[PDB]
Every structure is written in structure tokens, then in C-alpha cells.
Design a protein around this ligand. Sequence first.
Ligand SMILES: OC[C@H]1O[C@H](O)[C@@H](O)[C@@H](O)[C@@H]1O
Ligand SMILES: OC[C@H]1O[C@H](O)[C@@H](O)[C@@H](O)[C@@H]1O
Ligand SMILES: [Cl-]
Ligand SMILES: [Cl-]
Ligand SMILES: [Cl-]
Ligand SMILES: [Cl-]
Ligand SMILES: [Cl-]
Ligand SMILES: [Cl-]
Ligand SMILES: [Cl-]
Ligand SMILES: [Cl-]
Lengths: 345, 345
Amino acid sequence: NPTIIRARAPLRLGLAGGGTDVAPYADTFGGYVLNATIDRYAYAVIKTLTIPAVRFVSTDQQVEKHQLISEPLELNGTLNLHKAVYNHMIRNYNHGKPIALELSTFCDAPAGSGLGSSSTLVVVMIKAFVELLNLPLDDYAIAQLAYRIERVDCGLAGGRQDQYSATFGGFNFMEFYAAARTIVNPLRIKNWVLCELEASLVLFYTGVSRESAKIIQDQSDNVVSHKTAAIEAMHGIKREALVMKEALLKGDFKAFVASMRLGWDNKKNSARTVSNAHIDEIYDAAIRAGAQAGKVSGAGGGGFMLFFVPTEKRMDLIRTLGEYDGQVSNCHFTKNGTQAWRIAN
Amino acid sequence: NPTIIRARAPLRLGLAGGGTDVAPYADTFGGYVLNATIDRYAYAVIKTLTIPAVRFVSTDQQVEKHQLISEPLELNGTLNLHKAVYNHMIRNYNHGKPIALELSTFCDAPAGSGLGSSSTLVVVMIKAFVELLNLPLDDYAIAQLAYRIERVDCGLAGGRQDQYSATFGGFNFMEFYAAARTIVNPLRIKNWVLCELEASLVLFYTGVSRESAKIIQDQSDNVVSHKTAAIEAMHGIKREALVMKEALLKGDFKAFVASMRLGWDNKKNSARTVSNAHIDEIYDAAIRAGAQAGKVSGAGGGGFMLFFVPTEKRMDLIRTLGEYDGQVSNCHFTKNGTQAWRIAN
Ligand SMILES: OC[C@H]1O[C@H](O)[C@@H](O)[C@@H](O)[C@@H]1O
Ligand SMILES: OC[C@H]1O[C@H](O)[C@@H](O)[C@@H](O)[C@@H]1O
Ligand SMILES: [Cl-]
Ligand SMILES: [Cl-]
Ligand SMILES: [Cl-]
Ligand SMILES: [Cl-]
Ligand SMILES: [Cl-]
Ligand SMILES: [Cl-]
Ligand SMILES: [Cl-]
Ligand SMILES: [Cl-]
């Protein structure tokens, strides 16, 4: 009988260090990222089919259908990530015999949101197959596989932090070294600290970023072409990620906001398009309204912004942001990583 | 040294039965409500003061200051709920001796959202005092106190369901009887059911409702003046709340959507202003886009709508709602009730 599986994986806020996890920097100097998963998800669904076909459906409702063939599916530029996950699973776990199924995805945030959805989507597709095939893949293995599939098989450039947040969940401080070596440090944050942090964070969706590819290219060029000042901006991004991690472990909110301010200055100095006049206007208005610090989540150039605001100024900040283009929301963290469940069989 | 306490309490989605928990109906026939707390909060903060004064600050930033007097504060129509909570605590737990403090509130949703914020705000103010004074008030006692303060001391009409959701948290099926007797039934929903439900729910904020008072007045008049058909609509609201509860416990999503459709029809028939042409247009568009059921959370007339959509139509629904006036969000449930923490002393 037909099997139906669903999997979900949480999206993430990049709190600090983002950009240091990308190849040239992470391989040369070692990267640090502090991130935390939130209550918005990417999803994948597998439905086994009673016809000899394979169908792929994407979040923006592109759809491809193929006949059941004993060769890997071609990565032709349409739904490459879906096909690459399918190819890997059929080759490695099903002895190369095609499985008739429909693989679909959807997501609580669109592309370019600064919430890590591209890689989170790959993780959740892998997780659905883990559940379908009953695979003993541990969390490190799932995150590493997602990296391989996206960055190598599909050749899409980027870092490592999103694969780990989507898989592990929670607040994590990650260390990135050469030869694909990553250490995930789960942060066991005190309950009062988590509550205080949620009470002090405001999220603001500014619109779609089209800058991620350019920023990552620029940051990689900084290192390769030895751009001294821009490399030093990246060293600053790294330093402040460690300062922020220690601030959260110590419940030191003064140090937390200071590190976010320094981090944001460094991040903007690392690549030209991280911020722009539009983002700066919103940032300036938020600070005037009483926010103490803020930043763009993800590479930069648009997507979600996050602000730290003392509770007595929170409603004023929310009102102020209402006057700008974009959507305000609260910030609610999740402790669980990717999960799967069955609906049929 | 100065003490700082914060408390938070989750807001709630009224899944079924709302309106049957209000006095004339609940006292005469018994009410049923099924509700669930979500990841948006009301907050209260108490700061002890070093000057002989008391200050109250509201979510919309009204502010009152008074000198320290050994008489109850007058409920003059400005910040009555703040003053009434303060009055009760000073009289019952501090032998009538004034305490110098600032009591402030803020909230993740504005007034008229259909998320139960008015009563949730009272609960969270009580919880801050529970923490400040180290009171042994259990959950039933906190919810009952919040009812008394809001409905009796401040004379504001309404039901009982919000006090209980804010205090207890989670998915609850509540039974309301005469003489203020309430039974809270926590629903121990299977993990797959919760995940499936979140994957199938879409929230849509339509704007502020100004209809709550009118709807509740009308529903109360139905009973008092023996309006036969409108009373029978309310009996239907009640019946479908029980059907929906059993559907969730049995993981029966077909029965869940059928009960929501019948519930919504009954709810609209119980009071003239529950829906309107604007809400009906949005509802109609959501159904055409693929939603299977939907309703307004809270009394009606505006505020949050919720839609049940099969996962293969979810992104289409989200796109469609984008074309209407209001804000789309995912739906994420919380299991915890009201909580407090300390920042100073
Ligand atoms: O560049 C910021 C950020 O962008 C994407 O989300 C990924 O490539 C991450 O690995 C990286 O940290
Ligand atoms: O009338 C619907 C709803 O409105 C408010 O939230 C309260 O008065 C509740 O007790 C009631 O169930
Ligand atoms: Cl970052
Ligand atoms: Cl994203
Ligand atoms: Cl991102
Ligand atoms: Cl980032
Ligand atoms: Cl209801
Ligand atoms: Cl509300
Ligand atoms: Cl309400
Ligand atoms: Cl309701």
C-alpha cells in the first residue's frame, strides 16, 4: 500500500559569525558561527506511487515528472536538489533500482529570507528518505551529506552552518576547520536567559535578498586576493561570534548587545552589498526608537533583520517598524532538529 | 536592592466552542471550548521603586503614576486592570500596605486580535505578583483570580476560556458549568498529530476586530430572550467542540475538518457580526485556493483567521492570501503555560 512520509526542519537565525564558515576563510583561519533555530520550518513529503514514475515538486510549485529509468537523473537546472537527493538515495541505499515516488517540498519562508532555507530544504529531503528507507544516518552524517549534495553534486557555493542548524536544532556554536571538519557545540542556555532573549528580540522581514551569492563571492575573493582590511573585517566577525557565545552562557546581556554591534559593523565592512541605504534607514530608525543593536540574518542585502530592544522600548520599536516596508514578528526559538512522521504505512 | 521580575503567558487560538463559555449559555446548558496556546505572548514586568510611588504602563503605552497611599486605587477607567491586580495583591497579601513598584505590560499581538490577549494580560500580571510575593497560587486559582479581577472587579463582560489557556498552556478541552465551575482537560496529543496539524494550519491576521463586545452581548441575549434558532446555533458550536476534541485524540483529520466547517457555520449563525462580507471574501478565496476549512479565532468580526489546508495546496493558499489585506503566518503551538523569571534580586 502507498506510503506517505513527511519531514520538517527548523529554519535559523544567524546570530554571529556568518560568512566565516565559507570555504576560503574556514579552510585558512577556521570559522565560528553562533546560530539558533526558530519556529519556522522547511518540509519534505514523500509519497510512493502506484505508477512507474518519479515526480518532483518544489516550494514555488515547479514540477518535473520522469519515467522509471535505471540511470541517475540528469541535473539539468530544474529541481537539481530534489534530483540529487533522489540520485544519492537510489544509488547508495537501493542498489541503483529506481523507486516510484513523489518528492515535494514547501517552506514557511521564501527564498532569500536570510533564514538558511536553501540548505534546510536539502536536510529535510534527506530526513524524509532516512525515514522512508530506515537509514542509520546520525546527525553529523545527515549534515555532511546535505553539504555534499548541495555544494558538490549540485555545485552551489556557500558555507556549512545551515546544514548543522537544520539537522541538530537549538542554539549552537559551530567551529569550522579545513577538510570538512566541523564541531557542533550545543549551548545549554539557562531558561531565564532564553526567556529574556525572546522578550528582547524583534524580527523584521525586509523583502527578498538577491545578494547572498554576491556577498559570499566577495568574501571568498577577500581571502584569495589578500584584501587586508576586508580580511580583518572577517576576523572581527569571527571574534565577536565567540564573545556572543560566552555572553549567552554567562547571561551577560550587556556583552551580548556590544558584540552584536561590533559584529554588524564588521559584517558590513566584509562585503559591499551586506547593507545598503534602505537597510541602513530601517536600522537607523530602529535604533532611534530604542533598539540597542541589530543586524541582517544570513549573508546580507535583504531578508530578515533582528533587533535587540530593552523591554520598555519594545512596543515603540514595533510601532516604528510598522512605518517601514516589511513585516514585524516576535522571535521564538525551537530546541528540536529535523523530525519525520508517517501518515500512511 | 531593586527587584526586577518578568512574566509571560501564551496567547491562544480558539479552535472550537468559543462563545459557549460565556455566562448565560455556560450557566444554563454548560459550555465546551477546545483551544491551544501558540508561540506569541503577553508579558508583565514588575520593578520595585526607590521612590514612594506606584506606576502603571500599558501595552499601548498609557502611563499612570500615583503617590503611595494606604487606600485601594480608584478604578477610574484608565489602566483599570493594572490597578485592580495591584489592589488585590496589596489587600490580600500585604495587609493593605502599599508597595512601591512599576507594573508594565506589553504583548505580541494588539487588542482585537482574536487571540485572547485581554485576559492573557491579566493572567501575566497576576503571575508577576505570584513571583514577586512568592504566592502558593495553583493554576486553577490563578485562572479564577484573573476571571474575578477582570469580570467582577473591573466589570468587563466575557467568558472563561482565555484565563485557563494563558495559565495552563497547551491543547485543552474545557468544560464550563454554573457557579464558576470549570474542568480543564489537557489533551495529550500524539506527536505525529501535532506535527501534521502545524503542517496543515495557516494563520491570517485580518486587522483589528471591534466586534467582540457586540457578539458576546448578542449571544447572551440569544439565551436570555429565548431566540430559538440562535440558541440552536450555539448548541451546534458546543457539539462540534466535542467532535473536534475526539478527532484530535483519534488522529482523525477528516473528522477534524468536517467539525471545523460545521462549527464555523454555527458560529456565524449565533451572532450577526461574527462574519461580514470582507471576511467571507477572504474565506471564499482561501477555499478556492485549496483550504478545506477555516474560521475566525475569538468572537469574530476580524482578528486572526485560521485555515486548514492539505500540504500539497499550502503554498498556493499562502500566495492567494498575499493578495488580500492582512498578514500570513505559520502556526506553532506551545505546551507551557505562564512563566516568570528574575533579572534583578
Ligand atoms: O554567507 C552567509 C550564509 O549563507 C548561507 O545561508 C549559507 O551558505 C551559510 O553557510 C552562510 O553562513
Ligand atoms: O466570545 C469569544 C471569547 O472572547 C474572549 O476572548 C473571552 O471573553 C472568551 O472567554 C470568549 O470565549
Ligand atoms: Cl551571522
Ligand atoms: Cl532563507
Ligand atoms: Cl540565508
Ligand atoms: Cl548568518
Ligand atoms: Cl472557538
Ligand atoms: Cl487578542
Ligand atoms: Cl479574543
Ligand atoms: Cl474562540
